[PDB]
Amino acid sequence: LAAEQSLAQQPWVEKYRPKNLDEVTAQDHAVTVLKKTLKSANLPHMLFYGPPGTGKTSTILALTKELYGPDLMKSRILELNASDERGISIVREKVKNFARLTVSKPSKHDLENYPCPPYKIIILDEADSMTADAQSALRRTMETYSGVTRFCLICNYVTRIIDPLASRCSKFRFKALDASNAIDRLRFISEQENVKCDDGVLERILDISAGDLRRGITLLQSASKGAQYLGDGKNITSTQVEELAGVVPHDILIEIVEKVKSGDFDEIKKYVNTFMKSGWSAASVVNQLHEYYITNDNFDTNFKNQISWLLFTTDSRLNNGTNEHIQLLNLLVKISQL
Amino acid sequence: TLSLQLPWVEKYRPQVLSDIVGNKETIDRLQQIAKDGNMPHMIISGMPGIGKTTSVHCLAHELLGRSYADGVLELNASDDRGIDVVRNQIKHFAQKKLHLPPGKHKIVILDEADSMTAGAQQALRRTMELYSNSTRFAFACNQSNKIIEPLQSRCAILRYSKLSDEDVLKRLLQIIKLEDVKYTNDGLEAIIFTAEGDMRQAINNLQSTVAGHGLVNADNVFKIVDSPHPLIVKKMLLASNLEDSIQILRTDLWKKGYSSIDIVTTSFRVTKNLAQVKESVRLEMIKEIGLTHMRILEGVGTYLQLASMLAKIHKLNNK
Amino acid sequence: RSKENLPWVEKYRPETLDEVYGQNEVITTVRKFVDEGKLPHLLFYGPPGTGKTSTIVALAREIYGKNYSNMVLELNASDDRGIDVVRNQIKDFASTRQIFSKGFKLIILDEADAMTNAAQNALRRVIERYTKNTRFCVLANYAHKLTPALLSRCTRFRFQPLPQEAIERRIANVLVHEKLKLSPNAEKALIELSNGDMRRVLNVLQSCKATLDNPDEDEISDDVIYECCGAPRPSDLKAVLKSILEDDWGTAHYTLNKVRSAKGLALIDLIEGIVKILEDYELQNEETRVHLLTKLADIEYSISKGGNDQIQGSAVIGAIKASFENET
Amino acid sequence: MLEAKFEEASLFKRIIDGFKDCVQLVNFQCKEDGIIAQAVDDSRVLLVSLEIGVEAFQEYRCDHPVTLGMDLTSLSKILRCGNNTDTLTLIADNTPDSIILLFEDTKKDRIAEYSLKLMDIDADFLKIEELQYDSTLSLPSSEFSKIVRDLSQLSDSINIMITKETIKFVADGDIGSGSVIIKPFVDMEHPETSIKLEMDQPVDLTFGAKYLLDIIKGSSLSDRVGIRLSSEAPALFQFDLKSGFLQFFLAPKFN
Amino acid sequence: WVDKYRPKSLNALSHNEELTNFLKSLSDQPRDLPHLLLYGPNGTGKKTRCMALLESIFGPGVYRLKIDVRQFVTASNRKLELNVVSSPYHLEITPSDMGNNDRIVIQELLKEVAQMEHRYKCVIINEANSLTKDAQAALRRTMEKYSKNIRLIMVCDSMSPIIAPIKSRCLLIRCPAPSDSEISTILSDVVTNERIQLETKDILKRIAQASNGNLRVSLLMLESMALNNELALKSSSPIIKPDWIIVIHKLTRKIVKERSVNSLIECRAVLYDLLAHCIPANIILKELTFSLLDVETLNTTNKSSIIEYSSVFDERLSLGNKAIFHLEGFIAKVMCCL
Amino acid sequence: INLLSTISTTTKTINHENINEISKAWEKNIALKPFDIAHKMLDGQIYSDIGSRNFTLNDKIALYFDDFDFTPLMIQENYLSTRPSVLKPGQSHLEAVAEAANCISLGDIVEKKIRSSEQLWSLLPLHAVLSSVYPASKVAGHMAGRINFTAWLGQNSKSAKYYRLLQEIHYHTRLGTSTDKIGLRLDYLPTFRKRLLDPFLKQGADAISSVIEVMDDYYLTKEDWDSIMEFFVGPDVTTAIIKKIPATVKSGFTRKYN
DNA sequence: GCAGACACTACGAGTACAAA
Ligand SMILES: Nc1ncnc2c1ncn2[C@@H]1O[C@H](COP(=O)(O)OP(=O)(O)OP(O)(O)=S)[C@@H](O)[C@H]1O
Ligand SMILES: Nc1ncnc2c1ncn2[C@@H]1O[C@H](COP(=O)(O)OP(=O)(O)OP(O)(O)=S)[C@@H](O)[C@H]1O
Ligand SMILES: Nc1ncnc2c1ncn2[C@@H]1O[C@H](COP(=O)(O)OP(=O)(O)OP(O)(O)=S)[C@@H](O)[C@H]1O
Ligand SMILES: Nc1ncnc2c1ncn2[C@@H]1O[C@H](COP(=O)(O)OP(=O)(O)O)[C@@H](O)[C@H]1O
Ligand SMILES: [Mg+2]
Ligand SMILES: [Mg+2]
Ligand SMILES: [Mg+2]
């Protein structure tokens, strides 16, 4: 009862964390394999790799709950994130000791109700952060002890994982969560929290999220809280969602394109300064610039080929932690010269 | 089976100083010291498998006669060679009293001496001089730079060189005659070529070829021992056209199982060791392979990145 | 358990030297070595999942018998790579005799490419001194990590990536042991996607048996393989490349977005398929190849670090379009 | 279930101390006849074969064969967590997991319950080869431990030679050499101090000093130790207990 | 003084009413609050808005701050000391004071608070841009696991440094910089209460235009004028620029006037003088680039090349420990361009 | 002595015929001082067509590897103080200097990747080329003045000390000031000067109390005052100003604060 | 039983990291 109320009053990201494997909205190609492996007891070594907010952790926390049961999961599960040191020592001392230990004794209740497979799952969240030495140490630790332990590694980028480690693990790619596949789940959450929306609000939330369900849930919760504070009783509108999602208004983007059209460095610099006097994030500006330029059919193919590469370079630099103003000005000036 | 035969490397190890083929001047000097006596402190440096341990052991045996059991002290990298061994084992061995032939003295052989700790090397400096009347220290190491200069000062520096193909051919022919192995000139030439002056590798490859296939021929030797990786790397780097180099990378390296890190590192080494290409071009290609090496070490190791590296190198060569 | 509750990668681990396929040269040469008794110091170097550990374990089983786990010193060099191990465990094992039966001793060093330089510099004389009674086996993915000295005392065997015949034979054995069927085109897709690794084919086969509604009455088609792995179908790759090459930008964007969204295809997989196909092409000028390869490498490296998927896809489209615009 | 009670809780402590240093991981297999243990060192040079019998326990009950895998270091601590004037109880459930060790003294009512997590050790060869050794000798444990500890200081290798009614222990090192020669003598007034030696063929073989120093650690169990030697066979150093024995199979060095 | 007049409640906020209303909407029901990431131009006033929101959630003792020192040990035996600014209902952590050991304080101290547990204590990460990517990846799972006890509010100036998973995990609240009108109104209230005689009111607008949206800078400049004009601002009062600004301006004059390696000598000397005196290199790069762009003599080609080289070397600096190695390269490339 | 002892065993006459081989076999390979590495690295003869054959690229990598902690810094310090002699036709000194600086920036990136949590020491040969060999080859020639030592170390230590001092003042002022470390130095310190030192410059010895007040408004100490007055640069440098306030005002200020 | 007496194990500070 206490846990039910606690989860009932928590962020909607955590309130609606999938308790079971069926609640996973669109990653069927992995949860189906896990569901059929529930019947058997031959869980492979697994590497969950995909974009953030796709559902790797939720899937791996529902799988253990279904396989072992609530009470027994604590005994048969070892979870290690990047918040814990994961050098060679914590691979050769903590992980190896956990693997060497015999499987915990299932109780009668767990055996009658839950499948209780004869192994334990080690969940390594953010395995990409681990150094190559620790992964090389884990290489044979997973192998020789596969009888009593199973290894799951969750990584945002599969390239960080060393080649033999990824070779041993079954690779599960969690697909991006666009509108088409996750609209049902978003509408489910909205209906459970009595959120009143216009026709395209949920779909628009999903498009701004760009493959991340967690961002969509956060945006929906923010919009719902704003609407409840307003007290009007109307519905959240798409423009409200765009305002709350850090999306540059179409008027300001249009003004930006008009300034790029007139190739004056001083005017572009002044408008860029005035624009950066607002917290319009440069990445969200480059995304909308790409949408406008590429989607529009009034631009030549050669111009599109050049501008796509320019936007790609700007995104690559902006994802490295540089100054947003300088990169945005460089991009706009180079498009003006185009 | 239960028992195994001796490798020809150890079975046919030279037991007298005359059997050692290469580096004639140093070996003749060691024979002259062997006959006369009074061997000074020495540091033997060179490349693997050109007879450095064997030379010092032939010298020590011939000097000490029947007293090799007590007068000679082995210390190897496999043992504990910290400052403790200098304080406790080396010092006690050097202080020991032992009656020897009039010219000969007790001998300390420190094999793999390049791995000695700085503290131990510094502590050995006074043990070398104080007890030199009774004991003579001998060092053998691949790199003479690792041994401290104060130690280098007190000893004669003998530097061994890579063995010429002729001497390797002579030694292999002698082993061929003793072991009655069937051979062809092409097979022997391939063995020397693959060994690249490393006589140890030459003998090991010869014995492996004889065991696996039974005849020393070019085909059998090349089957049991691959053609050198740096050679195919150099051929890929020095290709005239991009497509040819891509074909070499695809067929000879990627399809044959060589890992991307290996290709990039060997490309860097071949580039820095190349001579025909001018230094500026070599440096710029080195920069491109450095970028590629960073990408590979960051986890992105694919045929695409190597192909882009070759494309950049060809652009650099094509002005 | 009964070795049946284990992953197919582990349950189908070879136990005899006759169950290792692909590396027929190495297996035959090593079998002849051990039969005549002139077994040298071995260095098996090769890519992951090519069967080096299985080969050496089966060799130990053949030479020593069933009790090979007490009479062979198998050391995971990743777990213990210090010089203390060389001084204490390795040297004591090599020097002494055997507690079980008379014979020589074998030391199997797994993942010795992680061994520290001091440890290898210590072992280069442990190998030499005790060659009368012991032999050393060194397993390596990367030979550049290993010291040059340790690469001259060991006879070298390279493990090639697994060809079509051996991998196909192993799939045949697996579908015989289970109750499964594989379509010829699906088997072709499995081989193409394997990249020479039996671990990949075993894992994908287990997953494809899992995704079937019921095994032993349904077949595993190419659709099953591609969906379970998530790899792009050749038709999708060809359609995306054709749309990029010979049509306007808008429908090229439409085709890429629709192909990615409908099947959940990732961008990097599409890039790899496209670069493979374009490498299969014949191109009139070198500049096209140079620009195309360099650019796609740049987008791939940027994708590895994350970012905006749409921007990278548009960059790929523009790069291909400009590179083939150089072909006019 | 397993419920095995030692009257002398210090007995199990002493046996466990006997081979805690040699090996860390052990599989105590409890059957109806008693607890039997076999283990191999990391260097794979020494084998330890404990055989405890039913007579040792006050009350021994083993419903079905059970294997308990454990680490010697933690179990040694747990045994040291008990008083001398205590009785010990090993308790194991139907499924082997988290063995319970239970120390009681009822003279002053005190209970001490401890747990030890089991560990999955795959190696269960469980085989020894009884052989007709070339020589069988028996000497007091104190004398043999004294000799081994004093010859270990000269070198790391100790050579044992068995000849016609002669036992020789040699140690040649860098600071010098040493050699002790003993003869088999039978003493009527005090039987425990006698030396027995039955030889079929003279033996000459060497051991390492560290392993001998670790074997002689079992001298606290029995007052007399037997040594079985043979030509290229694992030397048998046996300490006979009241109900069973503790035997070290050592592998001699190669000439 | 800026300290003399700082809003202490949401109802006292005077600029960007939209943000104020959004903060009251979030504070309406505080039992359901996702983690926050405030971002925008420096000097906007985001920290004050965080404090006002915190005051609306908890009681008005949120401003009773106390400094405490918590000693920690790193991977080596070296000892680090962090001063934690704390309140009965919240705490503040600024990783930027440490170097690469920030992960430690992120992984231990935060978790400690989670072990300790108006059921949540807010932790304010004042400097999250300086947070190492490894430290952010360590905070990644602490963010989700302990969401019922710890709720983060992270203050930022640029979102680009922060990795994607963190941005996904927290609600993004933009802070637009106040336009010149609200800055002028605040300055008018300040001069009214501080009794600064004003010849006219155009001085306040000039100060607003000379600060580029910064309210801290505007108020401090107002005080600096009041200390040079005897608390009586005149029409011709020269605007006080901080020392580093004049140094960068003189560096720009030297660069444009003297395009020689001998001039590069003095440019490196000036850069060393700036760097050794507690000035970040990225800010120097930004100011120098914009000052170079503002010089009238150069043609558009030179300005475009300058912005391109500035972007490239800004990326280089973002991926480089030694700051001067990239700043001198930027200056040399600019001098070569001219 | 040992050379003669060893060589005289076989060859009884050491003359001009064999001296070359004796030198080539017995030459001492001593790690050069960083000044010598800088001198040889920035030498025109080394990177010429003829000189490259005598001193191969591998030898230049070895020169870097002699001291891998200072040669990158020495080259960075003394690559702009040389008269070049390998300028390509159509290139000035400034272009070569800019290319060298770009290469040093790339080498700094490589060094950070080498010397960070990833510890990619396998890039050490690459860091040899990008940081030292390539820029020196770009600006190779004669040494114009003297070879100076790396100034980066001293200014880095100075920056660390000033950062520490700024941390103390910032944490002292934290309870009032809503800022970060950098913002304080950027904005407040220029204003803090006008309220701390300028009253001593203008109104006189009666400013102490007022100064003390603002001091006590932010928990500043006398050491804090001395530290704040040491952070200004360029026009607003206070080192000469603090000398020109008469000693009476200083003594009264310290006495009143105490 | 109670106190030292070497001897083993745990802790802490310093240094080097490549290629041939
Ligand atoms: N497939 C999904 N179905 C339903 N809800 C989901 C799904 N994926 C994400 N969510 C929601 O988003 C929250 C976070 O999901 P996570 O599994 O932690 O995302 P993630 O894959 O771990 O991303 P990381 O940890 O940054 S790599 C969950 O608690 C759900 O509320
Ligand atoms: N010059 C030589 N003449 C004859 N056999 C040689 C010669 N050089 C090497 N060998 C063979 O190679 C084996 C190894 O010789 P060593 O001297 O031990 O090698 P090394 O030169 O000391 O290099 P290491 O051992 O890697 S430091 C010898 O036992 C011979 O079989
Ligand atoms: N040649 C082969 N024949 C049959 N099965 C194979 C073969 N190679 C790999 N496998 C399968 O793949 C599994 C892994 O084999 P391993 O030998 O452990 O891989 P590896 O060669 O050691 O590569 P590593 O461990 O990454 S260095 C085996 O248990 C088999 O199921
Ligand atoms: N509504 C407001 N009224 C008065 N002053 C404000 C207001 N908003 C911001 N400020 C001023 O802005 C200054 C700096 O704000 P701060 O929160 O430190 O910015 P940041 O956190 O972005 O660095 C404060 O000194 C404060 O006086
Ligand atoms: Mg997660
Ligand atoms: Mg040698
Ligand atoms: Mg393996």
Short mmCIF file of N, CA and C in Angstrom, two decimals, chain E residues 210-286:
data_model
loop_
_atom_site.label_atom_id
_atom_site.label_comp_id
_atom_site.label_asym_id
_atom_site.label_seq_id
_atom_site.Cartn_x
_atom_site.Cartn_y
_atom_site.Cartn_z
N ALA E 210 24.95 48.24 -22.99
CA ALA E 210 26.36 47.91 -22.80
C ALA E 210 26.58 46.62 -22.03
N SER E 211 25.51 45.96 -21.57
CA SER E 211 25.63 44.72 -20.82
C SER E 211 25.21 43.49 -21.60
N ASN E 212 24.49 43.66 -22.71
CA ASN E 212 24.08 42.55 -23.58
C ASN E 212 23.24 41.52 -22.81
N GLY E 213 22.23 42.02 -22.10
CA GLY E 213 21.27 41.16 -21.43
C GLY E 213 21.65 40.73 -20.03
N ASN E 214 22.85 41.04 -19.56
CA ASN E 214 23.27 40.66 -18.22
C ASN E 214 22.77 41.68 -17.20
N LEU E 215 22.07 41.19 -16.18
CA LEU E 215 21.62 42.04 -15.09
C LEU E 215 22.67 42.22 -14.01
N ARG E 216 23.45 41.17 -13.72
CA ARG E 216 24.58 41.31 -12.80
C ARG E 216 25.56 42.35 -13.32
N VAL E 217 25.92 42.25 -14.60
CA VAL E 217 26.86 43.19 -15.19
C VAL E 217 26.27 44.60 -15.19
N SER E 218 24.99 44.73 -15.52
CA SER E 218 24.36 46.05 -15.56
C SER E 218 24.38 46.70 -14.18
N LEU E 219 24.01 45.95 -13.14
CA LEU E 219 23.98 46.52 -11.79
C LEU E 219 25.38 46.86 -11.30
N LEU E 220 26.35 45.98 -11.55
CA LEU E 220 27.72 46.26 -11.11
C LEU E 220 28.30 47.45 -11.87
N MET E 221 27.97 47.58 -13.15
CA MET E 221 28.41 48.74 -13.92
C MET E 221 27.76 50.02 -13.40
N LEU E 222 26.48 49.94 -13.02
CA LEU E 222 25.81 51.09 -12.44
C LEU E 222 26.52 51.55 -11.17
N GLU E 223 26.85 50.60 -10.30
CA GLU E 223 27.58 50.95 -9.08
C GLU E 223 28.95 51.54 -9.41
N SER E 224 29.63 50.98 -10.41
CA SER E 224 30.97 51.46 -10.76
C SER E 224 30.92 52.87 -11.32
N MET E 225 29.90 53.20 -12.10
CA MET E 225 29.66 54.58 -12.47
C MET E 225 29.37 55.48 -11.28
N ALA E 226 28.57 55.01 -10.33
CA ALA E 226 28.26 55.79 -9.14
C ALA E 226 29.49 56.06 -8.28
N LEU E 227 30.49 55.18 -8.30
CA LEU E 227 31.72 55.43 -7.55
C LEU E 227 32.73 56.27 -8.32
N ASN E 228 32.53 56.50 -9.62
CA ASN E 228 33.39 57.39 -10.39
C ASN E 228 32.74 58.73 -10.69
N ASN E 229 31.44 58.88 -10.44
CA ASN E 229 30.72 60.12 -10.71
C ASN E 229 30.12 60.71 -9.44
N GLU E 230 30.63 60.32 -8.27
CA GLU E 230 30.19 60.86 -6.98
C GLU E 230 28.69 60.68 -6.76
N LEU E 231 28.20 59.48 -7.07
CA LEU E 231 26.79 59.11 -6.86
C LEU E 231 25.84 60.02 -7.64
N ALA E 232 26.32 60.59 -8.74
CA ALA E 232 25.50 61.44 -9.60
C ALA E 232 25.87 61.15 -11.05
N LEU E 233 25.00 60.44 -11.75
CA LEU E 233 25.27 60.01 -13.12
C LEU E 233 24.92 61.12 -14.09
N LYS E 234 25.85 61.43 -14.99
CA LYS E 234 25.67 62.48 -15.98
C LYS E 234 25.50 61.87 -17.37
N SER E 235 25.15 62.73 -18.33
CA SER E 235 24.90 62.26 -19.69
C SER E 235 26.15 61.66 -20.31
N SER E 236 27.32 62.26 -20.06
CA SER E 236 28.56 61.85 -20.69
C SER E 236 29.41 60.93 -19.82
N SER E 237 28.80 60.22 -18.88
CA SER E 237 29.56 59.34 -18.01
C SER E 237 30.11 58.18 -18.83
N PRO E 238 31.42 58.00 -18.89
CA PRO E 238 31.97 56.89 -19.68
C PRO E 238 31.66 55.55 -19.03
N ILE E 239 31.31 54.59 -19.86
CA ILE E 239 30.90 53.27 -19.38
C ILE E 239 32.13 52.49 -18.97
N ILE E 240 32.09 51.92 -17.77
CA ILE E 240 33.23 51.23 -17.18
C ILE E 240 33.24 49.79 -17.70
N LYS E 241 34.31 49.44 -18.41
CA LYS E 241 34.50 48.07 -18.88
C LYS E 241 35.50 47.36 -17.98
N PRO E 242 35.26 46.10 -17.62
CA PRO E 242 36.21 45.38 -16.77
C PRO E 242 37.55 45.20 -17.47
N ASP E 243 38.61 45.10 -16.65
CA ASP E 243 39.99 45.14 -17.13
C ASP E 243 40.26 44.16 -18.27
N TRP E 244 39.80 42.91 -18.11
CA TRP E 244 40.05 41.90 -19.13
C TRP E 244 39.48 42.32 -20.48
N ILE E 245 38.37 43.06 -20.48
CA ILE E 245 37.78 43.52 -21.73
C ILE E 245 38.73 44.46 -22.46
N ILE E 246 39.32 45.42 -21.74
CA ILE E 246 40.27 46.34 -22.37
C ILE E 246 41.53 45.60 -22.81
N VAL E 247 41.96 44.60 -22.03
CA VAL E 247 43.14 43.83 -22.44
C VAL E 247 42.87 43.09 -23.75
N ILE E 248 41.69 42.47 -23.87
CA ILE E 248 41.35 41.77 -25.11
C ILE E 248 41.20 42.76 -26.26
N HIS E 249 40.65 43.95 -25.99
CA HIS E 249 40.54 44.96 -27.03
C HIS E 249 41.91 45.38 -27.54
N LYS E 250 42.86 45.62 -26.62
CA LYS E 250 44.21 45.98 -27.03
C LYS E 250 44.89 44.85 -27.78
N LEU E 251 44.62 43.60 -27.37
CA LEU E 251 45.13 42.46 -28.12
C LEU E 251 44.59 42.45 -29.54
N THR E 252 43.30 42.77 -29.70
CA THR E 252 42.71 42.85 -31.03
C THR E 252 43.37 43.95 -31.86
N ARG E 253 43.62 45.11 -31.25
CA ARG E 253 44.29 46.19 -31.97
C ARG E 253 45.68 45.76 -32.42
N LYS E 254 46.42 45.08 -31.54
CA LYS E 254 47.75 44.61 -31.91
C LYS E 254 47.69 43.58 -33.03
N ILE E 255 46.71 42.68 -32.97
CA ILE E 255 46.57 41.65 -34.00
C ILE E 255 46.29 42.29 -35.36
N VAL E 256 45.34 43.23 -35.41
CA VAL E 256 44.97 43.82 -36.69
C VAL E 256 46.07 44.74 -37.21
N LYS E 257 46.75 45.46 -36.31
CA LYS E 257 47.78 46.39 -36.75
C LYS E 257 49.06 45.67 -37.17
N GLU E 258 49.48 44.67 -36.40
CA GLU E 258 50.79 44.04 -36.59
C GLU E 258 50.59 42.54 -36.82
N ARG E 259 50.70 42.12 -38.07
CA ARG E 259 50.55 40.72 -38.47
C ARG E 259 51.94 40.09 -38.63
N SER E 260 52.70 40.05 -37.55
CA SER E 260 54.06 39.52 -37.58
C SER E 260 54.27 38.55 -36.42
N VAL E 261 55.24 37.65 -36.60
CA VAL E 261 55.56 36.70 -35.54
C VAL E 261 56.13 37.42 -34.33
N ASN E 262 56.84 38.53 -34.56
CA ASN E 262 57.30 39.35 -33.44
C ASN E 262 56.12 39.91 -32.65
N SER E 263 55.05 40.29 -33.35
CA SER E 263 53.81 40.66 -32.67
C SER E 263 53.15 39.45 -32.03
N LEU E 264 53.31 38.27 -32.62
CA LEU E 264 52.82 37.04 -32.00
C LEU E 264 53.51 36.80 -30.66
N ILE E 265 54.75 37.27 -30.52
CA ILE E 265 55.45 37.15 -29.23
C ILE E 265 54.65 37.84 -28.14
N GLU E 266 54.28 39.10 -28.38
CA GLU E 266 53.57 39.89 -27.39
C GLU E 266 52.14 39.39 -27.23
N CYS E 267 51.55 38.87 -28.31
CA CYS E 267 50.23 38.26 -28.19
C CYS E 267 50.25 37.05 -27.26
N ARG E 268 51.26 36.19 -27.39
CA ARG E 268 51.39 35.07 -26.46
C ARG E 268 51.64 35.57 -25.04
N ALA E 269 52.45 36.62 -24.88
CA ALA E 269 52.68 37.16 -23.54
C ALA E 269 51.38 37.66 -22.92
N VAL E 270 50.56 38.37 -23.70
CA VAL E 270 49.29 38.89 -23.19
C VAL E 270 48.34 37.75 -22.85
N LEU E 271 48.30 36.72 -23.70
CA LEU E 271 47.45 35.56 -23.41
C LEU E 271 47.89 34.87 -22.13
N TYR E 272 49.20 34.74 -21.91
CA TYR E 272 49.69 34.17 -20.66
C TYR E 272 49.30 35.02 -19.47
N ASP E 273 49.40 36.35 -19.61
CA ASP E 273 49.00 37.24 -18.52
C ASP E 273 47.53 37.07 -18.19
N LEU E 274 46.68 36.97 -19.21
CA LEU E 274 45.25 36.77 -18.98
C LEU E 274 44.97 35.41 -18.35
N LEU E 275 45.63 34.36 -18.84
CA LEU E 275 45.34 33.01 -18.37
C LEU E 275 45.80 32.80 -16.93
N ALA E 276 46.97 33.34 -16.58
CA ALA E 276 47.49 33.15 -15.23
C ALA E 276 46.71 33.91 -14.17
N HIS E 277 45.81 34.81 -14.57
CA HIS E 277 45.07 35.65 -13.64
C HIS E 277 43.59 35.27 -13.58
N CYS E 278 43.31 33.97 -13.60
CA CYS E 278 41.98 33.43 -13.28
C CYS E 278 40.94 33.81 -14.33
N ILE E 279 41.30 33.64 -15.60
CA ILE E 279 40.41 33.94 -16.71
C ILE E 279 40.32 32.70 -17.60
N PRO E 280 39.12 32.17 -17.84
CA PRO E 280 39.00 30.99 -18.70
C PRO E 280 39.36 31.31 -20.15
N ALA E 281 39.85 30.29 -20.84
CA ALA E 281 40.33 30.46 -22.21
C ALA E 281 39.19 30.56 -23.22
N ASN E 282 38.09 29.85 -23.00
CA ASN E 282 36.97 29.90 -23.94
C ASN E 282 36.35 31.29 -23.98
N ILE E 283 36.23 31.94 -22.82
CA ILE E 283 35.70 33.30 -22.78
C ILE E 283 36.65 34.27 -23.47
N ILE E 284 37.96 34.08 -23.29
CA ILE E 284 38.94 34.89 -24.02
C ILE E 284 38.77 34.70 -25.52
N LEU E 285 38.60 33.45 -25.97
CA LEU E 285 38.39 33.19 -27.39
C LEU E 285 37.15 33.88 -27.91
N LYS E 286 36.04 33.78 -27.18
CA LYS E 286 34.79 34.41 -27.60
C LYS E 286 34.95 35.93 -27.72
#
